[PDB]
């Protein structure tokens, strides 16, 4: 193997490296790690843990939050160079090296294999906080979360004397590493150690044919791309637009439902942006596939006055998930500066609350094409599992999702004071953010935002370990003292040990 | 390694194989062969040759035409699976598998060594047809084009009884098979042989160490991003406007410009679109970059009465490709029908010909915001190699570039109407293409188009081959017939053989 390289502010890489997803957040190690290797990343680390250097790692670059790219930060392990995607035959998984982006991952265990696995959408979103952070996507309804597939984690830890080692935890019973396997299934990156890969299987597969290893997702699929122009909206249009999509979703988010292979997103655009719209897609193969999309749409559209465009058309899998994927080159990839929240839903918002949410998405005293609140369907087979066998909060059937970004830094003020308002209205009665409750579930890790922990925006008394992990934090907290001490690994929102 | 997938059309994979970039041509082979190996390549094309079927080559789907997916094709050789790229210790060049995309390359050429080559700026598009083609892009100016780097090419080959072998063919002074590495200096995709890798190095590179067998590209680059709104946009400004842009760029295309750094791309889009577009982009340690950008700008606006919304930034290179390159994934790239066109010059367009331009970019009884033609600028240290070394015609100063793509097959006559009418009316003095004269150099094989071979379209007399190889047909018609005497790779535009 080659040597890791080490990228220092003098060496040409170093400003981009620097520079990821989120460019309000600009790194300034001392260097940039890229290693080949395992034994290269125990390298990297035991240096920084010798000489007590505040240690971080980046797979993706996708981080919500300055959690990586903190101006404290000594030294950044770059991951993105181990990126190997094959599969595994002594463990009969595919293994999947921690800087392999979602995207990449698809299609390499598509073509190669006829299989897949339900991570999300976004195209270079890397495995290493995917995954470990509990990650979903628009097969999730059927497949449940990626992390029901997680057979298994190799991770760099380090102990109470500085020892660092590499460890392999599964999810086999008899495991005595098991623990460090579960908080892998939901507890969120940059929390235990350095995950160098990880292995997918389905607990239930049959053999150890590849072809077997991981489900195969339906062949094709009927998708609606559906737009509801912005210039023919009132309030009441949009109070009851989004009023049945809830309720719809609502109906429809067990595995009992003759509609639950039905996944669909709403995105509701500032009104700068023309337009509300819609995708929805239904596996070709569930009995009245087509039917089942049109009483879908009419349901819809019921008492509301504004009528959508739609176009209607039949994908193969790959490409229906390429169609609704997020790019990662082009003008909302690169040079964006962002801000995102979450909050997760098991019952409808009030048609107060939707009101709210009209007064800030109309607003004309503003100006972001790409402000948006989007309803995302969910549900399924995520909440079949007992909630105790993974660290993944259960039991939202919808999740919804803010997110503003600009390119002007002179606007972030403004930018982030419409995010911060609008999901504060949304919330006022509970304080302004979800605390679990008979409506809120809480919150996502893998779209952090640090306001959670701000007396200014969170009124409630609920802390942000509670509304990102409920009941799962304190037995994080216990797996995290036991395996990383010393607290190497930690940003704003880490497990604290205790 | 793994056994060779075959995919056969009762295989759940078959229909997304069957589907690349452009969806009016569907493949329809009796199967997909996968290959992991130059071996299991060679055992594919063996297979093929022995029963005398039908055979093409896919890397990466970017083909404008049917060459790879036309109905008569009876296997199609998916080379996904091979897309290692790595420095070769034994050559001292980097090693690109033909099925890794561009995106990728410059992704790990970067950041691993801190180099790049000249190539495109679409995320998607496959080594194997993009450099023998005689790839360029952005940085071609100062850098040349990506032949201009090719050092080796291994491609598996047939001779006269049917014996398939592999042949390494580099560009040294004694290799017997020189003559087989400048075919794949622009004599294009699908015609000698299959492609299996190409090795990468500056001619003139020092010593053997990997950060110097190809170019570091300048790490920084002013970037300025335009429009003009169609609103009021006249015939007048219309025509002013781009005089302005080719005036300039044709003033500015040569080495001695101390402007030929500055690289950019007007997008005339219908208007349909809405604006006029263009990007530009100049490294920053050129003297006085931020000034020249402005003069720059100045000129292209004067005499012009819309006035352009405009946005300035500096960036890392890497970060200024993705910006301005097209994503792989998303409604842009994913279920799109498509028609491409190409044109390069020598000289300016006259005050007719971007009259009748106009006229049919304004066409009030036509809408697709996808449509347009674009200039883009070219030259510089391309024209600086002998014309004889590669196969690739040099000469144009500057690329023009047409594009129509829309998703209604019940819409394909209305776009090709428009392309082809648009197309014929600007080169209505030369017989409706661009005949290589004093104004035009001819069109680019990685853009081709059968309507030059359609006695409908070209009332010309010059034959497709002239156009797009001009003085090199010849010599490439002798090494297709040393090299495939049978006539196995063929396609519409193929090197025929004498
Ligand atoms: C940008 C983006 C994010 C998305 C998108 N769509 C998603 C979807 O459809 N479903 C999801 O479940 N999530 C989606 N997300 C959110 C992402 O899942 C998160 O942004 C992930 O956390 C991103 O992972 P990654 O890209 O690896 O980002 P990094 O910023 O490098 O790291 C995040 C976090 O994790 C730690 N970390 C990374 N790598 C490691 C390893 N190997 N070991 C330990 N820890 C690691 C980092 O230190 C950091 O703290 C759509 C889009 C466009
Ligand atoms: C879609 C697309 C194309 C682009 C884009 N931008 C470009 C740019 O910025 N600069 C360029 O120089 N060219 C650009 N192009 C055009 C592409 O260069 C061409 O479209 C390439 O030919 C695409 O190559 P590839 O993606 O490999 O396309 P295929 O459809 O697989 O094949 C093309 C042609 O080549 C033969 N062939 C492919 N692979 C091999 C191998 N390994 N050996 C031999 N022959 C091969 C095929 O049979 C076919 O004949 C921007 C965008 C978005
Ligand atoms: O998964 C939805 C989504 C879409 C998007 O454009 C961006 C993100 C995102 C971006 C950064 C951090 C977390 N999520 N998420
Ligand atoms: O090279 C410019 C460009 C832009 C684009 O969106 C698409 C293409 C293209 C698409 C198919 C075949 C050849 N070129 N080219």
Redesign the interface.
């Given at each position: 193997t080659?040597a890791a390289?080490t990228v220092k502010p003098d060496?040409?890489?170093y400003?981009?490296?620097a520079?990821a997803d989120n460019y309000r957040f600009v790194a300034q190690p001392e260097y940039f790690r890229?290693p080949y290797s395992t034994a290269q990343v125990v390298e990297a680390v035991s240096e920084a843990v010798a000489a007590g250097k505040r240690l971080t790692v980046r797979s993706g670059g996708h981080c919500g939050e300055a959690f990586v790219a903190s101006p404290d930060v000594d030294v950044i392990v770059?991951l993105?160079?181990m990126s190997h995607v094959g599969?595994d035959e002594e463990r009969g998984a595919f293994e999947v090296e921690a800087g392999a982006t979602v995207?990449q991952i698809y299609?390499?265990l598509?073509?190669?294999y006829?299989v897949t696995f339900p991570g999300g959408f976004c195209?270079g979103v890397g495995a290493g906080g995917h995954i470990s952070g509990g990650g979903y996507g628009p097969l999730s309804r059927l497949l449940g979360l990626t992390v029901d597939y997680l057979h298994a984690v190799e991770v760099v830890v380090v102990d109470a004397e500085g020892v660092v080692s590499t460890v392999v935890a599964t999810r086999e019973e008899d495991d005595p590493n098991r623990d460090l396997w579960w908080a892998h299934t939901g507890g969120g990156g940059g929390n235990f150690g350095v995950i160098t890969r990880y292995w997918l299987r389905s607990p239930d597969a049959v053999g150890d044919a590849p072809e077997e290893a991981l489900p195969?997702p339906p062949?094709?699929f009927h998708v609606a791309r559906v737009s509801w122009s912005w210039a023919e909206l009132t309030e009441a249009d949009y109070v009851r637009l989004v009023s049945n999509f809830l309720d719809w979703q609502l109906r429809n988010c067990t595995v009992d439902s003759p509609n639950i292979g039905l996944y669909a997103l709403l995105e509701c655009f500032h009104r700068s942006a023309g337009h509300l719209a819609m995708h929805a897609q239904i596996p070709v193969d569930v009995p009245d596939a087509e039917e089942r999309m049109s009483w879908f749409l009419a349901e819809l559209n019921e008492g509301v006055a504004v009528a959508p465009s739609l176009?209607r058309?039949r994908?193969?899998?790959?490409?229906t998930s390429?169609?609704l994927?997020?790019?990662?080159?082009?003008?909302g990839?690169?040079?964006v500066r962002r801000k995102v929240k979450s909050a997760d839903l098991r019952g409808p918002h009030t048609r107060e609350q939707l009101a709210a949410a009209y007064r800030h998405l109309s607003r004309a005293d503003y100006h972001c094409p790409s402000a948006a609140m989007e309803y995302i369907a969910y549900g399924g087979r995520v909440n079949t599992v007992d909630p105790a066998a993974t660290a993944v909060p259960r039991g939202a059937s919808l999740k919804t999702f803010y997110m503003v970004a600009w390119?002007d830094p002179d606007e972030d003020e403004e930018h982030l004071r419409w995010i911060r308002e609008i999901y504060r209205d949304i919330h006022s009665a509970t304080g302004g953010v979800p605390t679990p409750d008979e409506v809120n579930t809480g919150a996502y890790i893998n779209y952090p935002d640090i306001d959670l922990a701000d007396p200014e925006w969170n009124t409630s008394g609920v802390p942000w370990h509670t509304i990102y992990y409920g009941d799962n934090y304190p037995r994080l907290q216990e797996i995290k003292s036991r395996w990383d001490p010393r607290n190497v690994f930690r940003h704003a929102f880490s497990i604290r040990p205790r």
């Amino acid at each position: 193997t080659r040597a890791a390289v080490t990228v220092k502010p003098d060496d040409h890489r170093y400003d981009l490296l620097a520079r990821a997803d989120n460019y309000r957040f600009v790194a300034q190690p001392e260097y940039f790690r890229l290693p080949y290797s395992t034994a290269q990343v125990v390298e990297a680390v035991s240096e920084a843990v010798a000489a007590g250097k505040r240690l971080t790692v980046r797979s993706g670059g996708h981080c919500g939050e300055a959690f990586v790219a903190s101006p404290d930060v000594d030294v950044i392990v770059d991951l993105s160079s181990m990126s190997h995607v094959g599969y595994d035959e002594e463990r009969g998984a595919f293994e999947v090296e921690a800087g392999a982006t979602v995207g990449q991952i698809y299609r390499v265990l598509y073509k190669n294999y006829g299989v897949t696995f339900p991570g999300g959408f976004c195209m270079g979103v890397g495995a290493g906080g995917h995954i470990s952070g509990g990650g979903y996507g628009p097969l999730s309804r059927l497949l449940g979360l990626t992390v029901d597939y997680l057979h298994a984690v190799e991770v760099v830890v380090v102990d109470a004397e500085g020892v660092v080692s590499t460890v392999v935890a599964t999810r086999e019973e008899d495991d005595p590493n098991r623990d460090l396997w579960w908080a892998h299934t939901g507890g969120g990156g940059g929390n235990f150690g350095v995950i160098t890969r990880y292995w997918l299987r389905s607990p239930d597969a049959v053999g150890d044919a590849p072809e077997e290893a991981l489900p195969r997702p339906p062949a094709s699929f009927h998708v609606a791309r559906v737009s509801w122009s912005w210039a023919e909206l009132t309030e009441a249009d949009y109070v009851r637009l989004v009023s049945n999509f809830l309720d719809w979703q609502l109906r429809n988010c067990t595995v009992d439902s003759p509609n639950i292979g039905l996944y669909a997103l709403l995105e509701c655009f500032h009104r700068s942006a023309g337009h509300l719209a819609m995708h929805a897609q239904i596996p070709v193969d569930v009995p009245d596939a087509e039917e089942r999309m049109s009483w879908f749409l009419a349901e819809l559209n019921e008492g509301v006055a504004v009528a959508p465009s739609l176009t209607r058309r039949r994908l193969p899998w790959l490409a229906t998930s390429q169609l609704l994927a997020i790019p990662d080159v082009g003008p909302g990839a690169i040079g964006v500066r962002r801000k995102v929240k979450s909050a997760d839903l098991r019952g409808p918002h009030t048609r107060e609350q939707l009101a709210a949410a009209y007064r800030h998405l109309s607003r004309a005293d503003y100006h972001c094409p790409s402000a948006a609140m989007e309803y995302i369907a969910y549900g399924g087979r995520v909440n079949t599992v007992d909630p105790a066998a993974t660290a993944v909060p259960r039991g939202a059937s919808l999740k919804t999702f803010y997110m503003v970004a600009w390119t002007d830094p002179d606007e972030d003020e403004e930018h982030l004071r419409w995010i911060r308002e609008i999901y504060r209205d949304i919330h006022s009665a509970t304080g302004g953010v979800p605390t679990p409750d008979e409506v809120n579930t809480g919150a996502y890790i893998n779209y952090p935002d640090i306001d959670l922990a701000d007396p200014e925006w969170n009124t409630s008394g609920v802390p942000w370990h509670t509304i990102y992990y409920g009941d799962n934090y304190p037995r994080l907290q216990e797996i995290k003292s036991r395996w990383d001490p010393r607290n190497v690994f930690r940003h704003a929102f880490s497990i604290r040990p205790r």
